[PDB]
Amino acid sequence: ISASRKLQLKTLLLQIAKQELEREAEERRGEKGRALSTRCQPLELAGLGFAELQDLCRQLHARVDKVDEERYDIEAKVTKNITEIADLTQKIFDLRGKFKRPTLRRVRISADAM
Amino acid sequence: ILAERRKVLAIDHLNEDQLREKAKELWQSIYNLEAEKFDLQEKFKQQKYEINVLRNRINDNQ
Amino acid sequence: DEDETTALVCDNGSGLVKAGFAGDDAPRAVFPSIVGRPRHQGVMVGMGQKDSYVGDEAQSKRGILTLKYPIEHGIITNWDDMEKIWHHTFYNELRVAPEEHPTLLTEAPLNPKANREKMTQIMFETFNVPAMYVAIQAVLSLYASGRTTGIVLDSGDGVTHNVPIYEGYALPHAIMRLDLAGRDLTDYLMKILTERGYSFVTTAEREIVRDIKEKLCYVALDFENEMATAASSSSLEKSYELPDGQVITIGNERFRCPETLFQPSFIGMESAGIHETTYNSIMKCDIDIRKDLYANNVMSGGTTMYPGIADRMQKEITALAPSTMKIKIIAPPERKYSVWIGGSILASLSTFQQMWITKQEYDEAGPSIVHRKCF
Amino acid sequence: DEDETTALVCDNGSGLVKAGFAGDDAPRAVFPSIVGRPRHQGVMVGMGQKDSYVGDEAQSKRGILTLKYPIEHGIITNWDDMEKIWHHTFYNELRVAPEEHPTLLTEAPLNPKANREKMTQIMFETFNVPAMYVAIQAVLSLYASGRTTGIVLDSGDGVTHNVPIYEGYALPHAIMRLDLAGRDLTDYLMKILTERGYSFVTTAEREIVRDIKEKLCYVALDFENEMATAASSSSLEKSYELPDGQVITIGNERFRCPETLFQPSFIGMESAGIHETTYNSIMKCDIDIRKDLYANNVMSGGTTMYPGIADRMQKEITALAPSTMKIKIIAPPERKYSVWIGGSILASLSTFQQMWITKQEYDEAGPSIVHRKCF
Amino acid sequence: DDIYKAAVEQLTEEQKNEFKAAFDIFVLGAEDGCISTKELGKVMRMLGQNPTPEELQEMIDEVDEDGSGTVDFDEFLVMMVRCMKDDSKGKSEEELSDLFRMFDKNADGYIDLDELKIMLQATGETITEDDIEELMKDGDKNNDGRIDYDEFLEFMKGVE
Ligand SMILES: Nc1ncnc2c1ncn2[C@@H]1O[C@H](COP(=O)(O)OP(=O)(O)O)[C@@H](O)[C@H]1O
Ligand SMILES: Nc1ncnc2c1ncn2[C@@H]1O[C@H](COP(=O)(O)OP(=O)(O)O)[C@@H](O)[C@H]1O
């Protein structure tokens, strides 16, 4: 098989993944917007007096504390996977290094020149 | 850490105009923090994908 | 010649020293472990001449020189001669020297420890090397060969080490060291060629018979059948050209020399041969090791260039080995050079950069440091 | 990662560890309860190599490792080793982090406190499991076996439990902790195979004998006539292939090993054996209980997979038992895996959702809580 | 055809300018603009490759499909990327990891033949019975029947 068929299909294959990845990002933006509407609903502050506005303020204090408690735990979970990835990646590098490390190089040229 | 990170509003001694503005300040903070949670959750899932791929790569080269 | 402080690598035996720089997959040049001296009285003047000759100089002017080898069975007995050989190796021909480069040496696991102590002292005090490491020849053969496991028969010039390695670890209880090597095979050959009417006694003659062995000899997969024909027919004979235009015609001696590897009794040694020796290095290891060592018989060093050695060894081990089990042999073109090559690989590995003795640790501890820092 | 926050279940014996998630019908993976460590000095560099290997890694790399068992006849004495086995189990084979799931572990109640206390502590403090539950092996075996009443014979690697249960209740005065197990059967076989000319004294050798036992041995309902012939004829010997290709044949020794369970004097133990111990557990229960236990002897754990064992046990008990009555053995295919299967069943029962220790109650009380919340 | 177009697309401006300037050494001047094949060894070295005489001859042996005795400029770029892999950037592991995940619809850690076919047919390019398998066997260096994450990264290095 000609190089041009093989290269164009792996090229087209990567290009479709790029379109799908751009969609993943748009889908995440769409879902984040909807998640925000329901997770952090708007304040009905207009038309309220002192006691009513204080209740909104107290509710927000509880809500900001809760959003950081959950954010912190999620942040820790993201961090845990990053640490495991760095460790798994190094194990892979050493297993693979054993296959090519000791034998691959650009050598024995001066051997003929001399 | 959370006590240091959470924002706190003045409440009991504020009048209506002050309370509307203070309620607004945490609302936007919460909104932005919920946005971070969403993105962190998506990052977590993408990183979990990489984790299982890597666990298999170790066994595949061993 | 070089634009980086790469480690230098030297494989110093009783035959030749292979040398070059780390990162290459071959030595840059070969330096015979020879110091030559005139055995005649000079008559003419204005003739140049040396007090002593080394390496290739020693061989090129050998017609009137006696040629001596400073190394015996892997041990330097004359290190003043090795310093002259090394000075030439480094400063005249390879154009690199320990003075501006770290240096790796290759050695057997049971090489007398005092020998490493002296080589360590020389490279640090005579050649001013900034750092050193002395590596196991079997390790170097396994890196060059693409393996972490196997029995390495390092076939030196004066001794064969025979050490099993598994998963990168030594299995020292199963080392079967044998006092049989390429230089002893030469002795057998010259004695049998003497029987045919071609004695080899003096230096020029000693060098010729070594050269005959390297170019004409082989082991073959079956000695007795090879002899049934070689001892019966001239069709198995080969005429070798001697320096003066005369020739020597050699018959079954062509294989009887190499055969000493399988029959050490030929030179008076109390041994069953290299295949039995390899077998015991495998067989004395635990049974969950044995399968990996049977699958990895690694030939290295010299004499492995003899035709039929891969087949002779695999078949003899298979015969000694349990049935069902698969016996495999590694005998790459990186033969005779694989110890040097492994030295290049090891010296340059990133995993080895902290394994070097620096010329700080050396002076604080002295030469005996090699016994604690290398192996 | 799962479709429910299902408990994870891990059955950690002195032999092997079976693990998977609650609600399945099998463990996802089985590991030896082994942590292996190299007993050799490394020679090559950049070889990777762990300080310790666990489970199947420990067995696959065993050629140069000493293999230790963290569990001693049902008791974890080395909890650092069990934490590593568990991390491997949970993250590499089950692929589920315990932080999001309750975990159920098992032990005999006869176990002298430390096992349930440390099992609870490891999962709460090193894995941050949200909840814990240490289960009874007899309970788990009866659920897996389809019984509420009967005697659980779990004759596995560590200790034989032999605990009777009636209408879901323990009858603890009748439970006889018995120091006769699969691990002792292996040691006996290593010694009698030594007499035959095949010595087994090292770790690799111990693992081989265990493999021989598991594949070649049987108990026989009639060992006396079986040995009269097996000890007289090669026609009853079975060949086993050793890792290095050598072959061992085993004759009356094949059953002689399992026979120890009925003849404990073979290993120096002062015991009546498992059939009489089971009988005595039945006898020690009230007279209106005895009949239900005689009719419901239930096999679990290991060694219960030997040919002739269900018949050997039923006949020995029948011989000790009174007339008129029918003595019966239940021997489900969920043998050896029955404690794990029971864990899956128990963890998932609605009537067992209040039995879990939460990771709140644990910290307020500490690990001694296991004595108030589990049993 | 498309291999020749792709080699042009993959070489950057600071590189293609050197390739044509050095490659023009193939014509002596006041001739016919032939651009001969015997000059390939010289240009490999002029552009920074460091081949042995055997390698210089191999570059020559791999050109001249029509027996014309010449090398065109786009043909040269194709022959150079097969000798000296001067692609454009060539991306990264992070970029291909995120893209890998898109083909791995079932999150199995590899791309099997069905995913490979769906992703390609989805581009509008017609996929025939022997296609897809031809790529799988290219990426699948270990002959395991699929292209895994590691194999994917090797397979698509230099792909846009
Ligand atoms: N065709 C051959 N026949 C016999 N011996 C050989 C042949 N080729 C190489 N050798 C031997 O190789 C030896 C030199 O290389 P080597 O022993 O590997 O270095 P070192 O002795 O330092 O380990 C010499 O003894 C030489 O005779
Ligand atoms: N075919 C067999 N022959 C002899 N013994 C067996 C066989 N199958 C299982 N056993 C024994 O089972 C023991 C494992 O005990 P096990 O019941 O699985 O502990 P746990 O209940 O905690 O999982 C091992 O010693 C093994 O030899």
Coordinates of C-alpha atoms in Angstrom, one line a residue, chain E residues 2 6 13 20 32-35 49 55 58 61 67 78 88-90 95 102 107 109 116 125 131 141:
Chain E
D2 CA -1.2 13.1 -1.5
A6 CA 1.6 16.2 2.8
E13 CA 9.1 27.9 6.3
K20 CA 14.8 24.1 -2.0
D32 CA 17.0 21.8 -18.7
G33 CA 16.2 22.0 -15.0
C34 CA 16.2 18.2 -14.8
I35 CA 17.3 17.9 -11.1
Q49 CA 21.5 14.9 8.1
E55 CA 22.3 5.5 3.5
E58 CA 19.3 4.1 -0.1
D61 CA 17.3 3.7 -4.6
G67 CA 12.7 5.8 -14.5
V78 CA 8.8 13.2 0.7
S88 CA 5.9 20.6 11.5
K89 CA 6.1 20.6 15.3
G90 CA 4.8 17.0 15.4
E95 CA -2.5 16.8 22.6
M102 CA -12.1 10.7 21.5
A107 CA -12.7 4.1 27.4
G109 CA -7.4 2.3 26.6
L116 CA -11.1 3.3 13.9
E125 CA -13.8 9.9 3.3
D131 CA -8.9 0.1 5.0
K141 CA 3.6 -2.8 16.8

